[PDB]
């Protein structure tokens, strides 16, 4: 095999998010922030599939296919691993935490 298959899932994740993002882009100027924070959170290792999907239901309305939440779990390795490379270039202080929630 080759080294760099994590690029595949990003296709569905980057695409999927674009749909649910608008599903709630009419609640308030903060949902637009929520959806954005949810995705950056799930990738920043500060969130989770079960949480992201569970929480996004409010801002983006994730309650759709009963098998939608599990998909992200299968493709997560790609989005996390592939994105980890570029993330390494930044490596800031996540300890800051701007949102800070209970989850």
């Amino acid at each position: 095999g080759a080294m760099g298959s994590g690029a595949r899932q990003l296709s569905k994740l980057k695409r999927f998010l674009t749909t649910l993002q608008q599903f709630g882009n009419d609640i308030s100027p903060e949902i637009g922030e929520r959806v954005r924070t949810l995705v950056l959170g799930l990738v920043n290792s500060t969130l989770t599939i079960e949480e992201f999907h569970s929480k996004l239901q409010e801002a983006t309305n994730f309650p759709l296919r009963p098998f939608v939440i599990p998909f992200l779990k299968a493709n997560l390795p790609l989005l996390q691993r592939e994105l980890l490379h570029c993330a390494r270039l930044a490596k800031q202080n996540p300890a800051q935490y701007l949102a800070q929630h209970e989850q």
Binding site: S11, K12, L64, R65, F67, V68
Partner: peptide, 18 residues
Amino acid sequence: IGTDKELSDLLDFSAMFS
């Protein structure tokens, strides 16, 4: 089916079974 399969295989369910 096709067309945004990645978006359909995860989003929407009633619009297809209704």
